[PDB]
Each structure stands twice: as structure tokens, then as C-alpha cells.
Write a protein that binds this DNA or RNA. Structure first.
Lengths: 92, 104, 78, 97, 94, 105, 84, 98
DNA sequence: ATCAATATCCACCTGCAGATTCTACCAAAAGTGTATTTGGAAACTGCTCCATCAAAAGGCATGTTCAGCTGAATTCAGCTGAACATGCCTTTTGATGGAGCAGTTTCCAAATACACTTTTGGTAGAATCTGCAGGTGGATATTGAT
DNA sequence: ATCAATATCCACCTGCAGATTCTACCAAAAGTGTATTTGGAAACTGCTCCATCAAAAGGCATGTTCAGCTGAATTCAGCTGAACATGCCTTTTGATGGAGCAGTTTCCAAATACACTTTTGGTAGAATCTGCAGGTGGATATTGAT
């Protein structure tokens, strides 16, 4: 028990900075970061769906949630990555 | 054959799903929602790691610390807005001294 | 105990805050404000504690308390 | 007999402290204050070291932030010396009062 | 078609209890509905979370009570917790 | 066929509040005492603000509570103000308040 | 229809003056009017933006008061009185 | 000819407007400003009358509160006349634009 | 602006210890293959509401004058807060133990979720009522000039 | 210390735009009889957590000096409030057409439910390493002083 996002953070770290490492304390911050953004996006999508009397959170909700939460440029890229991962998942 | 690899992500799609279901957000959850969400979490993570990576390099360090994440965030307009109500432990503040307070 | 938060320590905080010259009344003004801060946070934390029927305030109780006050903190379990 | 002009060392401390990230409040005195305030809410509590450490980080980041706004308020008043009325003005605009 | 619920029937009753002689304009009632819905959500919300932090799948009157203590200030809290407890123990007294 | 509200000794709809809890995705399951307790607090709070609103109405010599009356009651009660410190009441105006420095010297 | 331009100037000096009054302001410098318009414009952009986002998400062409109300809640400016 | 000294009428207006609750920006112009801004975001948008109503109430409530803070900033500078500088200090401390 | 004498910063190197990174293994997820439910999309369409128009009217927005008095400069000196060398003591910190207690387990009796079947309590309009928004007018200040 | 000049009340009036009730269904509580859990309630550990101890070391509490900053006292150019003359354009009323919310059905592509089958991520030791913390030695930044 006591799962975290460490492994995943670290893997993403090696893609953008193979050379770079990361202290424990710094890893704790990435964890906190991921949990926070996860809850905000999640939270907003929840409300969105409720506002429209829907019982299911789809990528449609997640996207609008990203649009409402992330600032301008960061929102664009997030929406890109998002639709890209969903697009590749449905295919194969 | 896991969903993350299928969506081609480093982040745990299957877990993001189990979390969405158990977080009491909605009665039902789409199949692409966890995928989508997982993709967003990874991107933002890369963004910070990238900038914090540089902040480290620009300081002669190889290993990223809290300071480096704080410098990466505060020195970036968008990341800073997104986390303007968040406090990174052990990150300190950006050096900045009001002009009026300078000598002569 | 609050007087335990010393002038030089408050000097240091102000400095990291960019403050050059400090008035002599700032010190007691700072303690009063620091005390109102901890009282609001700790009170919320200890409520999460008693709810969890514990005798030990955990870092998570403090993190959840800080989030309610709009003082979200990364690094201690969230 | 060397001596620095008032202000010179002050700026030097700003440059130093805005560069570091160590807690500026002495730990023991702090824990003592935390446990005391707490004693008023529930009796004989125990604190994870991590919890005391979270509280300190939070308050120090809060006070530092508050000093920034205070400094701005003092400057806005054509001053260079922060005062209680500056802390009071910031906390009012902030909605904490 | 398209029946939409409200708290008006209840706000109005409580009004007559406190000020028998007083009425309330619909706009003021509008304000009241927003208040009830807003507070209901904040409580339900904090409760939802309190339950989560404790690996608990159920929101009991105990969650609602601690949620009210986190949400409401001093006196309002003391009084609301009293009313709340009083109602529960009365409801359970069959 | 008693009503849960009456069993609780309340005006606010206990059943409705129990329905709104289940449909709000707050937790998997909902206790029987939760909706009761919550309808009790809701009723208490609308009672506290209608009391103060009613008095404001009386002072302005009106018999029907309007929004300005609600504002007066909220902004003048230290706790209701803190409770609704980030809420804006349409058509409620502000509290008569002029900084002293501004008054005829 | 008709092109919409410079409508920010519809926020006249006297209306801004009245708002300062309710806010308790006694003396207003000449530069205040252009600043207020600037600040109001940013205020509206953010609320309308979020509002219209809620509209689009529900595949509607009509911005409803609920949309505005949700947008205001997001932005931390909860409004009572239109909750509907 | 009779003449009130500068500031007397100003104070007369504060008492007046703090006593009332009516909207202070003209309706049509404001509806026109919203539609202009809304338009530069997404075209062919329609508005519920109450939506524009909710927008104005919020806007004026926001401006009125900003001016209070602004006023406090001027006073604190030992002035009585509010300046862009005050509005900017206000918004900066409000975390609306550090 | 230099002259000179402090003290400050600031590289380059360097050596160790606390962390990190790297390994070797197990339950609890996560992925599958089936078998059903069903949410809410598609296809009408009933029908509120929104966008426009027309028009008359007077509440206000505009612009211009004028000069009261406020904000911006200046001067100045008392005295508050910075820089310091001193002397002393509370905070560090580092085992050492004992122990108060989060964390698990193992039941299960009490409390919930269900799936239906009746029973009303509420919500949507008609049907009735009525505060109070404007309108007026003296009674009362409230101001600002002599 | 008076007054005109105006602005501010407060009470009295009266039909109507906006509440209060009065009626009727019917969506949604409430009453019943089962099928799951839920999450305490005792019993027991391994921990993290206080408590001392016990030195030592910075780090703080103190008293001097005095640099220079905050505030008070004066001036005064001209910005911004008060008043007014004009006449525009927002308000108010009502009407229309029809865009596009919303209510209903009809029902598949997609989601939830198992029952298993595999796989991965969280753990608790093992094998290096990034930097911290010092050490010079060398330009710098300061501040007194021709």
C-alpha cells in the first residue's frame, strides 16, 4: 500500500533530461503537483457533467475541464496531447 | 498490452481510471477519459521537468531539487498562473529587489 | 512561546521578502499575524485529526487544512 | 575601524536570503509555539515531525509573501521602512481582514 | 414540463416562524435559494472529502457534523451543531 | 406514513436533502442521519439570516424583505459576513461607510 | 447585423464616477476612467470566456444565466440572485 | 449665485449611492459591451436577458469593491484622490496580477 | 575619480556521507473474455425567448467655465532603526529507551442499498390581494457667505 | 453668530405590478420485505514519538553611535469638482417572426458486472555518487580620505 506517481514522473524525466536526476523532496513535489492537477481537472469535469445532467465523465468533459483550468498556451498543448493519446488508443 | 502503452503514454492510464471511478465524480466513466486525463497529466509533468531540468543545468547541478522547480514555475508566466496559489516547500523566492531600495 | 519567534528570525523573513528597513513595531505586529495564521490552520488540522479519531496530528491533516485555507502546500503527501 | 553605511548590509541580507531556501525560524521555538496553540483545541496531542515541518514551511512562505505586499504598501507611501499600518493594509486588501 | 424544484416552500415557512408579519420579495427568495444551495454544496463537499481521507464509503451524520465545524464560524457552528444533533437524536428516537 | 422531516422536528425537506446527497456523487453510500443533520443546519442558517433580514426590513419601515435587507443582515453580522465573505448578493448594494479622512475637516 | 466597436466607451465617465461613490471614493484623478475601462474589460473577458465555454460544452448557441453563474463561481465571484 | 465647495457634493453622492442598490452603468451600453466581447470569442452567440443581467450585477459589484480597496490605497498614501497607481496596488495585492 | 585598507564575493579543487540508484521479490491491480444494462444521441417538434423594429420622451451624458484646494516639491532636523563588537545561553542533535498508538485482523450486528407498490407533499398556473413606488409638501436641517 | 439657499426628511396618498393563496395532478417520498456490507469492537504489534541527557556552538540579547529617513511646515501651479446650457440616445411599450431550447421516444455503441488470468508496482537490502562544506587566492565592492 501507498502508491505514488514517482515511477511515472521519473520515466518522463528520463525522456526530457536523460542526464538529470531528482531529489526525494523534489519528487514529493511532482507527486503533489500531479495529485492537485488530477483533482482539479477531475473536479471540474464532475461539475460540467452535473450541470448538463450527465452521469458519465468522458474525454469531452476532461477536455473542457482542461480548457477551463489551464492557461492559454498550456491549454492548447494539453488539448493536443489529450486528443492525440485518445486518437492513438482508439485505433490500435 | 496495457492501456497506457496502447495510448502510448508513460503515465498509468489504468490507475487514472480506477481513481476516477473511486473519487466519486460521476456515476459512469468513459474509456478515453482516463486516457485523455493521463495524457494531460504527463504533458504538464514534462513541461515542469523540462524547465526544472534547465534551471538545474543553469546552476551546474545534474539532480533537480525543490529550488529548481520553484525557479521553473515562478519564472514561467503560465505555469506560475496555474500554481499561483500553491507553495512549493523548500523552493524559496525569486531574487528581486525593488528599484527604489537600491544604493545611490 | 510566541516571543520565541525572535526579532532576528523576523528580520530574516522580511529580508527574503525584499524588505530593507524595518520599523520597531513590526516585530510584535508580525507575531500577532503569525499566531492568527497558526490558530486557523492548526484548528482545522486538529479537526481532521479528531475526526480520524487519532491523538497524532499527521502531515496529511496539516496539508488538508492548508488546502481549505487556500494555502495549498506541495511536498508533504500533497 | 571599518563600518558599513546603514542599508548596505540590509541589501546584502536580502540578496543572501532570497538566494537560499532554509527555514528562517529556529525549529525548537517554533514547535513549542505550534504545540501550545494546539493545546487549546485538543489536549495532549502528538505531532508527526512531518506535520510540524509542513506547518513551518507554510507559515514561513505565508509571512514572506505578506512581507512582499507590505513592502509594496510602504513604497506606495513614499517610504522605505515597513510599518504595522502597511501589514494592516495588505491584510485588508487580501481579504484576511 | 418542466417542473423545477426550489426551497421556497421551506424558506417561507421558517420566515413565518421568525417574523409572522413579514413577507419576502421573489428576488430576496432568489437570494435565499442560492444560499441554501451554496451552503448545502459546501457541506456536502467537505463531507465528501472527509469521508475520502478516511477510506470511508459512507457519509454519516458524523461527517456532516465535522464538515459543519470546518465550514462555519464560531457561534454559528456551535448553534448549527446543536440543532443538527438535536434533530438526529430526535429522528432516531423513532 | 409520517414524513422524515416531522420525525426530525423540521421544516426543511429531509427526504429531498437525502435525494440530493445520493445524486451528487459525494460518496458511495449515505447514512440516514446525514440528510437529517444537514437539513437541520440548513434550516437553522436560513432562520438566522431571515431573523436579521426581517429586522432590517422593520428598521427601513418595510414589511416585505428585499435584497438590500439581506445585504444589511449579512454585512452587519460578523459571522454571516465571514461565511459569505466571497459572495455577492444581486441588488444588495453596500453598507453606508465613509472613511473619516474624507469628512469635512 | 451591425458591427460592434469601441463599446467600452459606453462605460461613461459619469457611470464610473457613480461606482467610485458607492465604493466611497471622494476625489477621482483624470486617468482613473481609462484604467477602470481597462480593468472592467479584463474582468468581462474572463467571465464571458468561461461562460461561453460552458455554453459550447452543452452544444448550445445561447449563453444562459446559469453559464454566467458557473463562470463567476469558477472565478471566485459567486453570485446569488440568478441561480434560477 | 450659491455654490457648494468642492467635495460637498462628492460626499453628497457617496451617501446617496451607498444608500441605494440600483445598477449604475446604463443597460444598453453594457449589453453592447458584452456582445462585443462575447463576439470576439465565438460568433453567432445569443444571450438570455438574465445572463446579461447576471454579468452587470457581478461587474458593478466587482468595480465597487475594487474602488473601496483603491480608496484605501490612496488614503494610505496620504491622498484623497484615487489614481491608476492605487488601482494597480490594489489589484496586485489582491493577487489579481502580481 | 582615485588612493588605500577593509571585508565581500567568487572560482577551482577536493573528499565523504547521506542519499540515490540498482537489485531481487510478491500481492493487488490491470488486462481479458462474457453477458448484460442503459445512458443520452438521433430524429421530431412543441413553443418559450431572443433579436429586431418603431417611436416618443426626458433622463442624462457632453463640453465648457472657473477657481478652490489638493498633490507634488522642498527644506529640515529630531530621533528611529542599522551596524556592531560583546558575552552568554537556548537550540542542536544524537543515542537511548520506553511506550503511547496508528495500523491490521476477525468477526458480525446494525445499518444500507434494493426492487416494488402506494401515498402524498410540491410545483405549475389561475384566482385574490396589497405593500409600496412615486408623487407632493411643509418641517428640518445643512451649507457657505457676511 | 446670523441667515438665505438648497438639500433632506417624514408622513400622508392610492392604484397595480408583484406577492399570496387556491387548485390539481404526479413525480417522488414513504412503507415493506430481502440481499449486502460497513466499519466498529477487542487484541496485538512495530513503530514513530516524546523525554532526557549532555554537551558545544553558534545565534541571539544588549548597549553605543550616529547616518539618514520619516514627517512636519510651506508654497503654489493647475487638476478636478461644481454648475450650466444643449440636445442625444438610452428607456419604455408593444409587436413579430422564428431560432433553438426542451420535452418525448426510440434504442444501439459503450459502460458496468463478474470470474479469472497475468503483470506491475510498492517493498526492503545492495552498489555507487552528486554535492555540501571547506580551503585558498584572487579580483570586487565599499567607504574613509588628497
Amino acid at each position: 500500500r501507498k502508491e505514488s506517481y514517482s515511477i511515472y514522473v521519473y520515466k518522463v524525466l528520463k525522456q526530457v533530461h536523460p542526464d538529470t536526476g531528482i531529489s526525494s523532496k523534489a519528487m514529493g513535489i511532482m507527486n503533489s503537483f500531479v495529485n492537485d492537477i488530477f483533482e482539479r481537472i477531475a473536479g471540474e469535469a464532475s461539475r460540467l457533467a452535473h450541470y448538463n445532467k450527465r452521469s458519465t465523465i468522458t474525454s469531452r468533459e476532461i477536455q473542457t475541464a482542461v480548457r477551463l483550468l489551464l492557461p492559454g498556451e498550456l491549454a492548447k498543448h494539453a488539448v493536443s496531447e489529450g486528443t492525440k493519446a485518445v486518437t492513438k488508443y482508439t485505433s490500435a | 498490452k496495457t492501456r497506457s502503452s496502447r495510448a502510448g503514454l508513460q503515465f498509468p492510464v489504468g490507475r487514472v481510471h480506477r481513481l476516477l471511478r473511486k473519487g466519486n465524480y460521476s456515476e459512469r466513466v468513459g474509456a478515453g477519459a482516463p486516457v485523455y486525463l493521463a495524457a494531460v497529466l504527463e504533458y504538464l509533468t514534462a513541461e515542469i521537468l523540462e524547465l526544472a531540468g534547465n534551471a538545474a543545468r543553469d546552476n551546474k547541478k545534474t539532480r533537480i531539487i525543490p529550488r529548481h522547480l520553484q525557479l521553473a514555475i515562478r519564472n514561467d508566466e503560465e505555469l506560475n498562473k496555474l500554481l499561483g496559489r500553491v507553495t512549493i516547500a523548500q523552493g524559496g523566492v525569486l531574487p528581486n529587489i525593488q528599484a527604489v531600495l537600491l544604493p545611490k | 512561546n510566541i516571543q520565541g519567534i525572535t526579532k532576528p528570525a523576523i528580520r530574516r523573513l522580511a529580508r527574503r521578502g525584499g524588505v530593507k528597513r524595518i520599523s520597531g513595531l513590526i516585530y510584535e505586529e508580525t507575531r500577532g499575524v503569525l499566531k492568527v495564521f497558526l490558530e486557523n490552520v492548526i484548528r482545522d488540522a486538529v479537526t481532521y485529526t479528531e475526526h480520524a479519531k487519532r491523538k497524532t496530528v499527521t502531515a496529511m491533516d496539516v496539508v488538508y487544512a492548508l488546502k481549505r485555507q487556500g494555502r495549498t502546500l506541495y511536498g508533504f503527501g500533497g | 575601524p571599518h563600518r558599513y553605511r546603514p542599508g548596505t548590509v540590509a541589501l546584502r541580507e536580502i540578496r543572501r536570503y532570497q538566494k537560499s531556501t532554509e527555514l528562517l525560524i529556529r525549529k525548537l521555538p517554533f514547535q513549542r509555539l505550534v504545540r501550545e496553540i494546539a493545546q487549546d483545541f485538543k489536549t495532549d496531542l502528538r505531532f508527526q515531525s512531518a506535520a510540524i515541518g509542513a506547518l513551518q514551511e507554510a507559515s514561513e512562505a505565508y509571512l514572506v509573501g505578506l512581507f512582499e505586499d507590505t513592502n509594496l504598501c510602504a513604497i506606495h507611501a513614499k517610504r522605505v521602512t515597513i510599518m504595522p499600518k502597511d501589514i494592516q493594509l495588505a491584510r485588508r486588501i487580501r481579504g484576511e481582514r
